[PDB]
């Protein structure tokens, strides 16, 4: 209150596809949340532990520094999402 989850005008969406579950996910996130928070939000929907999440964008591994702001992620759409792969095993 306001709180970053209710801060609609500063929120954005990142489109993710989990290959392990074969499920699409919309990651609504504050523009100023970090990659660390992004992974937490992905975990909430996929149960893939943050440090087990490998990200792929346009067929290449995507490496994001922990502090990278959501607003500075690559642009995604439902047709061009960030794929998530698990390092587990």
Swiss-Prot record:
Instruction: Give compartment(s).
Output: Cytoplasm
Q: Which residues form the Ubiquitin-like domain?
A: 12-86
User: Changing residue 19 to E does what?
Assistant: Decreases kinase activity. No effect on phosphorylation
What is the recorded phenotype of mutating residue 58 to R?
Answer: Decreases phosphorylation and kinase activity. Abolishes dimerization
- Organs and tissues of expression: Ubiquitous with higher expression in testis. Expressed in the ganglion cells, nerve fiber layer and microvasculature of the retina.
**How does it get modified after it is made?**
(Microbial infection) Interaction with SARS-CoV-2 M protein induces 'Lys-48'-linked ubiquitination which leads to proteasomal degradation. (Microbial infection) Deubiquitinated by Epstein-Barr virus BPLF1 on both 'Lys-48' and 'Lys-63'-linked ubiquitin chains; leading to inhibition of type I interfewron production.
The note filed under miscellaneous reads: In cancer cells, pathological TBK1 activation promotes oncogenic transformation by suppressing programmed cell death. Mechanistically, the RALB-SEC5/EXOC2-TBK1 signaling cascade seems to participate in both innate immune signaling and cell transformation. Additionally, TBK1 supports oncogenesis by directly phosphorylating and activating AKT1 at the exocyst.
Q: How does it assemble?
A: Homodimer. Interacts with DDX3X, TIRAP and TRAF2. Part of a ternary complex consisting of TANK, TRAF2 and TBK1. Interacts with AZI2, TANK and TBKBP1; these interactions are mutually exclusive and mediate TBK1 activation. Interacts with GSK3B; this interaction promotes TBK1 self-association and autophosphorylation. Interacts with SIKE1; SIKE1 is associated with TBK1 under physiological condition and dissociated from TBK1 upon viral infection or TLR3 stimulation. Interacts with IRF3, leading to IRF3 phosphorylation. Interacts with RIGI. Interacts with CYLD. Interacts with OPTN and TRAF3. (Microbial infection) Interacts with Borna disease virus (BDV) P protein leading to its phosphorylation.
Annotated domain remarks? Comprises A N-terminal kinase domain, a ubiquitin-like domain and a C-terminal coiled-coil region mediating homodimerization.
Q: What does this protein do?
A: Serine/threonine kinase that plays an essential role in regulating inflammatory responses to foreign agents. Following activation of toll-like receptors by viral or bacterial components, associates with TRAF3 and TANK and phosphorylates interferon regulatory factors (IRFs) IRF3 and IRF7 as well as DDX3X. This activity allows subsequent homodimerization and nuclear translocation of the IRFs leading to transcriptional activation of pro-inflammatory and antiviral genes including IFNA and IFNB.
**What pathology is it implicated in?**
Glaucoma 1, open angle, P: A form of primary open angle glaucoma (POAG). POAG is characterized by a specific pattern of optic nerve and visual field defects. The angle of the anterior chamber of the eye is open, and usually the intraocular pressure is increased. However, glaucoma can occur at any intraocular pressure. The disease is generally asymptomatic until the late stages, by which time significant and irreversible optic nerve damage has already taken place. GLC1P is characterized by early onset, thin central corneas and low intraocular pressure. Frontotemporal dementia and/or amyotrophic lateral sclerosis 4: A neurodegenerative disorder characterized by frontotemporal dementia and/or amyotrophic lateral sclerosis in affected individuals. There is high intrafamilial variation. Frontotemporal dementia is characterized by frontal and temporal lobe atrophy associated with neuronal loss, gliosis, and dementia. Patients exhibit progressive changes in social, behavioral, and/or language function.
Which family does the similarity line name? Belongs to the protein kinase superfamily. Ser/Thr protein kinase family. I-kappa-B kinase subfamily.
Q: What is this protein called?
A: Serine/threonine-protein kinase TBK1
